[PDB]
Coordinates of N, CA and C in Angstrom, one line a residue:
Chain A
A665 N 39.2 48.4 131.3 CA 38.5 48.0 132.4 C 40.2 46.4 132.5
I666 N 40.7 46.1 131.7 CA 42.1 45.5 132.1 C 43.1 46.9 133.5
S667 N 43.1 47.6 133.0 CA 44.4 49.0 133.2 C 43.3 49.0 134.3
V668 N 41.9 49.3 134.5 CA 41.5 49.8 135.9 C 41.9 49.0 137.0
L669 N 41.5 47.1 136.7 CA 41.6 45.9 137.5 C 43.0 46.1 137.8
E670 N 44.2 46.4 136.5 CA 45.7 46.6 137.1 C 46.2 46.9 138.1
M671 N 45.6 49.2 137.8 CA 45.9 50.0 138.9 C 45.6 49.7 140.2
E672 N 44.2 48.8 140.3 CA 43.8 49.2 141.4 C 44.5 48.2 142.8
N673 N 45.6 47.2 141.9 CA 46.4 46.3 142.9 C 47.1 47.3 143.4
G674 N 47.7 48.0 142.8 CA 49.1 49.0 143.4 C 50.2 49.0 143.1
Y675 N 51.6 49.6 143.8 CA 52.6 48.9 143.2 C 53.6 48.0 144.0
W676 N 54.5 47.7 143.2 CA 55.0 46.3 144.1 C 55.7 47.3 145.7
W677 N 55.9 47.7 145.5 CA 56.6 48.5 146.9 C 55.5 49.1 147.8
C678 N 54.1 48.9 147.4 CA 53.0 49.6 147.9 C 51.5 49.3 147.9
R679 N 51.2 48.2 148.6 CA 50.2 47.3 148.2 C 48.9 48.3 149.2
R680 N 48.3 48.7 148.2 CA 46.8 49.4 148.8 C 45.7 48.7 149.4
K681 N 44.6 49.2 149.7 CA 43.2 48.2 150.3 C 42.7 48.6 149.3
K682 N 41.2 47.7 148.9 CA 40.6 48.0 148.1 C 38.8 48.1 149.1
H683 N 38.4 48.8 148.0 CA 36.9 49.2 149.0 C 35.7 49.1 148.1
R684 N 34.0 48.4 148.5 CA 33.1 48.4 147.8 C 32.1 48.8 147.4
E685 N 31.0 49.1 146.7 CA 30.6 50.2 145.9 C 28.8 49.7 147.0
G686 N 28.8 51.0 147.5 CA 27.2 50.6 148.2 C 26.7 49.7 149.1
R687 N 25.4 50.0 149.6 CA 25.5 49.5 151.2 C 24.3 49.2 150.8
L688 N 23.0 48.4 151.2 CA 21.5 48.1 151.8 C 21.4 47.0 152.5
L689 N 20.1 46.3 153.2 CA 19.5 45.5 153.6 C 19.8 44.4 152.8
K690 N 18.8 43.4 153.4 CA 19.2 42.2 152.8 C 17.6 42.3 151.6
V691 N 16.7 43.1 151.6 CA 15.6 43.7 151.1 C 14.9 42.2 151.9
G692 N 14.1 41.9 152.6 CA 13.2 41.0 153.1 C 14.0 39.8 153.4
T693 N 13.5 39.0 154.2 CA 14.1 38.0 154.8 C 13.7 36.4 154.0
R702 N 23.1 42.7 151.3 CA 23.2 42.9 149.8 C 23.9 43.9 149.2
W703 N 25.7 44.4 149.3 CA 25.7 45.4 148.7 C 25.1 45.8 147.2
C704 N 24.0 46.6 147.6 CA 23.5 46.7 146.2 C 24.6 47.9 145.3
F705 N 24.0 48.2 144.2 CA 24.6 49.4 143.4 C 23.1 49.6 142.8
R706 N 23.6 51.2 143.0 CA 21.8 52.0 142.4 C 22.3 52.6 141.2
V707 N 21.2 52.2 139.8 CA 21.4 53.1 138.9 C 20.3 53.6 138.5
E708 N 20.6 55.1 138.3 CA 19.5 55.6 137.8 C 19.3 55.7 136.1
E709 N 18.2 56.0 135.8 CA 18.0 55.6 134.2 C 16.2 56.4 134.3
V710 N 16.2 57.1 133.1 CA 15.3 57.7 132.0 C 14.5 57.2 131.1
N711 N 12.9 56.8 131.2 CA 12.9 56.0 129.7 C 10.9 56.5 130.1
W712 N 10.7 56.6 129.2 CA 9.2 57.1 129.0 C 9.0 55.4 128.0
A713 N 9.1 54.5 128.7 CA 8.7 53.1 128.2 C 7.1 52.9 128.8
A714 N 5.8 53.4 128.1 CA 4.8 53.2 127.7 C 4.4 53.3 129.6
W715 N 5.2 54.2 130.5 CA 5.2 54.4 131.8 C 4.7 52.9 133.0
Chain B
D243 N 8.5 80.2 134.8 CA 9.6 79.6 136.2 C 10.0 80.9 136.3
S244 N 11.4 80.2 137.1 CA 12.7 81.2 137.2 C 13.8 80.8 136.0
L245 N 13.5 80.2 134.8 CA 14.5 80.2 133.7 C 13.4 80.9 132.5
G246 N 12.4 81.5 133.2 CA 11.0 82.2 132.1 C 10.5 81.2 131.3
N247 N 10.8 79.7 131.4 CA 10.0 79.1 130.6 C 8.7 78.9 130.8
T248 N 7.6 78.9 130.1 CA 6.2 78.7 130.3 C 5.8 76.8 130.2
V249 N 4.6 77.1 129.9 CA 3.9 75.2 129.9 C 4.3 74.8 128.3
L250 N 4.5 76.4 126.8 CA 5.0 75.1 126.0 C 6.3 75.3 125.9
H251 N 7.5 75.9 126.4 CA 8.2 75.9 126.8 C 9.1 75.0 127.2
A252 N 8.4 74.0 128.1 CA 8.2 72.6 129.3 C 8.1 71.0 127.9
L253 N 7.6 71.5 127.7 CA 6.9 70.4 126.6 C 8.3 70.5 125.1
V254 N 8.4 71.4 124.9 CA 9.9 71.3 124.0 C 11.4 70.7 124.3
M255 N 11.1 70.9 125.9 CA 12.8 70.4 126.3 C 12.4 69.3 126.5
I256 N 11.3 68.6 127.5 CA 11.0 67.0 128.0 C 11.2 66.5 126.4
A257 N 10.9 66.9 125.3 CA 11.1 66.2 124.4 C 12.3 65.7 123.7
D258 N 12.7 63.9 123.8 CA 13.9 63.0 123.6 C 14.1 62.3 122.0
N259 N 13.3 62.9 121.1 CA 13.4 62.1 119.7 C 13.3 61.0 119.8
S260 N 11.8 60.6 120.2 CA 11.2 58.9 120.7 C 9.9 58.9 120.1
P261 N 9.7 58.0 119.4 CA 8.1 57.2 118.5 C 7.0 58.0 119.7
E262 N 7.1 57.4 120.9 CA 5.9 57.8 121.6 C 6.3 58.9 122.8
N263 N 7.2 59.4 122.6 CA 7.8 60.2 123.0 C 6.9 61.8 122.3
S264 N 7.5 61.4 121.5 CA 7.2 62.6 120.0 C 5.8 63.2 120.0
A265 N 5.0 61.9 120.2 CA 3.6 61.4 119.8 C 3.1 62.0 121.3
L266 N 3.6 61.7 122.1 CA 2.6 62.6 123.6 C 3.3 64.1 123.8
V267 N 3.9 64.5 122.9 CA 4.5 65.9 122.8 C 3.7 66.8 122.3
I268 N 3.3 66.4 120.9 CA 2.6 67.3 120.0 C 1.4 67.1 120.6
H269 N 0.6 66.0 121.2 CA -0.7 66.0 121.4 C -1.5 66.8 122.1
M270 N -0.2 67.1 123.6 CA -0.6 67.7 124.4 C -0.1 69.3 124.1
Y271 N 0.7 69.8 123.0 CA 0.9 70.8 122.8 C 0.2 70.8 122.2
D272 N -0.9 70.5 120.8 CA -2.1 71.1 120.1 C -3.4 71.2 121.0
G273 N -3.4 69.8 122.0 CA -4.2 70.0 122.8 C -4.3 71.7 124.1
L274 N -2.7 72.0 124.2 CA -3.0 73.1 124.7 C -2.8 74.4 124.5
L275 N -2.6 74.6 122.9 CA -2.8 75.6 122.2 C -4.4 75.6 121.9
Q276 N -5.3 74.5 121.4 CA -6.5 74.6 121.3 C -7.7 75.4 122.7
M277 N -7.1 74.5 123.7 CA -7.7 75.1 125.0 C -7.2 76.8 125.0
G278 N -6.4 77.2 124.7 CA -5.6 78.5 124.7 C -6.4 79.6 123.9
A279 N -7.1 79.4 122.9 CA -7.9 80.0 122.5 C -9.3 80.2 122.6
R280 N -10.0 79.7 123.8 CA -10.9 79.6 124.6 C -11.3 80.3 126.2
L281 N -9.7 80.2 127.0 CA -9.5 80.9 127.4 C -8.2 81.9 127.8
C282 N -9.5 83.3 127.7 CA -8.3 84.4 127.5 C -7.8 84.3 126.0
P283 N -8.7 84.3 124.9 CA -7.2 84.9 123.9 C -7.2 85.6 123.1
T284 N -7.0 87.4 123.8 CA -7.0 87.9 123.5 C -5.2 87.8 122.9
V285 N -4.5 87.0 123.9 CA -3.1 86.7 123.6 C -2.7 85.3 123.1
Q286 N -1.5 85.7 122.5 CA -0.7 84.5 121.7 C 0.5 83.7 122.7
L287 N -0.6 82.3 123.0 CA 0.4 81.8 123.6 C 2.0 81.3 123.6
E288 N 2.2 81.9 121.8 CA 3.5 80.8 121.1 C 4.2 82.8 120.9
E289 N 4.1 83.8 121.7 CA 5.2 84.5 121.8 C 5.7 84.9 123.0
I290 N 5.8 84.4 124.1 CA 5.9 84.8 125.4 C 7.6 84.0 125.7
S291 N 8.6 84.7 125.9 CA 10.3 84.4 125.6 C 10.6 84.1 126.7
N292 N 11.8 83.3 126.8 CA 12.4 82.8 128.1 C 13.4 84.3 128.9
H293 N 14.2 84.6 129.4 CA 15.5 85.8 129.7 C 16.1 85.6 128.7
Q294 N 16.1 84.6 128.0 CA 17.4 84.6 126.2 C 17.0 84.9 125.5
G295 N 15.1 84.8 126.1 CA 14.0 85.7 124.6 C 13.6 85.0 123.5
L296 N 14.2 83.4 123.8 CA 14.3 82.3 122.8 C 12.4 82.0 122.9
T297 N 11.4 81.8 121.7 CA 10.5 81.3 121.4 C 10.4 80.0 121.5
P298 N 9.1 79.3 121.6 CA 9.2 77.5 121.5 C 9.3 77.3 119.8
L299 N 9.0 78.2 119.3 CA 10.2 77.5 118.0 C 11.3 77.6 117.9
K300 N 11.8 78.6 118.1 CA 13.3 79.0 118.3 C 14.0 77.9 119.0
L301 N 13.0 78.1 120.8 CA 14.2 77.0 121.6 C 14.0 74.9 120.9
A302 N 12.9 74.7 119.7 CA 12.7 73.6 119.5 C 14.2 73.3 118.0

């Protein structure tokens, strides 16, 4: 995680641009992140 | 199916070594095996193989 958060900044001679993950609506009157999973938790 | 799996092979596939899951798989397998003895009992359901030749016992 530390290595990822350090590399994402970029080199000192060339600063990059970052990007977000996922995009949804406000879900009723909100940049979300889908996560699938499989579970037989008693249905 | 396209892979050759029958109803019994799918029940082996969906198992994942869990308490409730194992109980459900065992109950459904036993029920299907018993019901197979009443409808067309001239054939055995535990001898049909996939395109790889495996049976439910070997596949498990």
